[PDB]
Structure 1
């Protein structure tokens, strides 16, 4: 697909390194043949970029070319479990290791800084972006990162899309960051899209502390009532964890474009 020349999108890549030199990104850019509007393309940023590219189908891309098509940016690695684990997980207080796999964790804010300060200018050199019309999508740990971005910097993206976010991570640590969201959101608007497959376990540990769906339903019931936040939860009946990656992306891309 990236090599294809006959679609209403063309694909190019740019490379960026992390500030520490240890992680090596490759951003795959899908640019519509359509001229951008005055204010720039709306932009869909995708984490897990290598997997995301694999889930972009030709039918989806053709429908996207509707007269207001988005620039697609898949943030991938040139190689990545270590990279993802570090980039997508929030830092704990004090003075960090992933509690399942033992790899370095806690790099989420460094990743979001790099997104803002390195990736966006790299992408803007290739195609004009409307920074008021940006979406951030991620699956699993990527969904954790999406929730971290919403909770700590709401409205920096117009639409947040978190598929099967790892809400279990570090005893539900992402849930602690939700406190104070109404305050940080004041005078701004955001949309949060959530997905979970009904055949998913509570965690990779199985279902020790809570029943499958419970953390999600509690999170939804909580965020449902937040002024300025438009919340859309879509359960995917009978889908397991792996399967919600492509499903969520197809369905995100079929939504009406960001206002």
Structure 2
């Protein structure tokens, strides 16, 4: 319903692209404020699982976002009949395992390891297409994701910091490949030299540790990252919520934060 609606201070339009290999099909939903852009361009919020993200963007949030410094919203979705692509997101949101050649997801068995190709496409194809539709302030960009989307967000921050000002990971799948993402954090302070980033983290109080000790891995990660120079960290636990529900909750709360400086 939201994408057709005409009563909000945002208008949504679609920008379509394929992956470089031709196997995955994207539709970016662009939400542009009626408000004129600042001289330096709109700040930008990029959202993974874009078809689900659009379903969570409520009217009250969107009215308040039009506050004189409203962001451009870019929801990166799959352009499929079903409006999901389990294979596509499994490949696009997971890092490669240097260990071996068996790049298959340990849970669902589908090909994995496409995170760097996905982030390269965002940089080299998606942003070019979005910037042609609306002026962007490239110093004021946010990347948000939930679950495997949050895994991709942490991969981006940990291995290629500086592409975004603010990283936002909701219920990231820290269990993935027995904690492999936690290894990628080693070396971050060196990679952040001369740069600044903000990381927002959420987890629901009712979530298990994995889909098959709850909270422990996140608590350890938070404790570690609080020590990292150049990184501003904000962890928000979500009392009363389980795994599915932290998607909408995190996005509402993100969009209520002060805009990136």
Deviations 1:92-111 (A, max 9, x none): 11551000000000000000
Deviations 1:121-143 (A, max 9, x none): 01011001111000000000000
Give the whole-Å Cα distance in 2 for the aligned partners of 1:239 and 1:166.
16
Larger displacement relative to structure 2 (88-97 or 49-58): 88-97
Please report how far the alpha carbon of residue 156 of structure 1 lies from its aligned counterpart in structure 2 after TM superposition: 1.1
SS at match of 1:242: helix
Give the whole-Å Cα distance in 1 for the aligned partners of 2:200 and 2:104.
29
Give the whole-Å Cα distance in 2 for the aligned partners of 1:229 and 1:93.
26
SS at match of 2:243: coil
Deviations 1:181-201 (A, max 9, x none): 001101111100000001000
Q: Report whether the alignment pairs 1:194 with 2:201.
A: yes
Deviation beyond 6 Å, 4+ runs, structure 1? none
Unaligned segments of structure 2, at least 5 residues: none
Larger displacement relative to structure 2 (212-221 or 148-157): 148-157
Q: What is aligned with 1:94? A: 99
SS at match of 2:57: coil
Please report how far the alpha carbon of residue 2 of structure 1 lies from its aligned counterpart in structure 2 after TM superposition: 1.1
Give the whole-Å Cα distance in 2 for the aligned partners of 1:74 and 1:28.
5
Please report how far the alpha carbon of residue 217 of structure 1 lies from its aligned counterpart in structure 2 after TM superposition: 0.2
TM-score (norm 1): 0.97
Give the whole-Å Cα distance in 2 for the aligned partners of 1:92 and 1:123.
31
Deviations 1:109-166 (A, max 9, x none): 0000000001000101100111100000000000000000000111210000000000
Please report how far the alpha carbon of residue 90 of structure 1 lies from its aligned counterpart in structure 2 after TM superposition: 0.3
Please report how far the alpha carbon of residue 5 of structure 1 lies from its aligned counterpart in structure 2 after TM superposition: 2.1
Please report how far the alpha carbon of residue 245 of structure 1 lies from its aligned counterpart in structure 2 after TM superposition: 0.2
TM-score (norm 2): 0.96
Calculate the aligned-residue CA RMSD, in Å. Answer: 0.7
Unaligned segments of structure 1, at least 5 residues: 206-210
Deviations 1:19-76 (A, max 9, x none): 0000000000000001101111000000000000000000000000000000000000
Q: What is aligned with 2:258? A: 256
SS at match of 2:141: strand
Work out which of the residue numbers 99, 121, 124 in structure 1 matches 2:131. Answer: 124
Give the whole-Å Cα distance in 2 for the aligned partners of 1:169 and 1:30.
32
Please report how far the alpha carbon of residue 7 of structure 1 lies from its aligned counterpart in structure 2 after TM superposition: 1.3
Give the whole-Å Cα distance in 1 for the aligned partners of 2:186 and 2:65.
36
Please report how far the alpha carbon of residue 18 of structure 1 lies from its aligned counterpart in structure 2 after TM superposition: 0.3
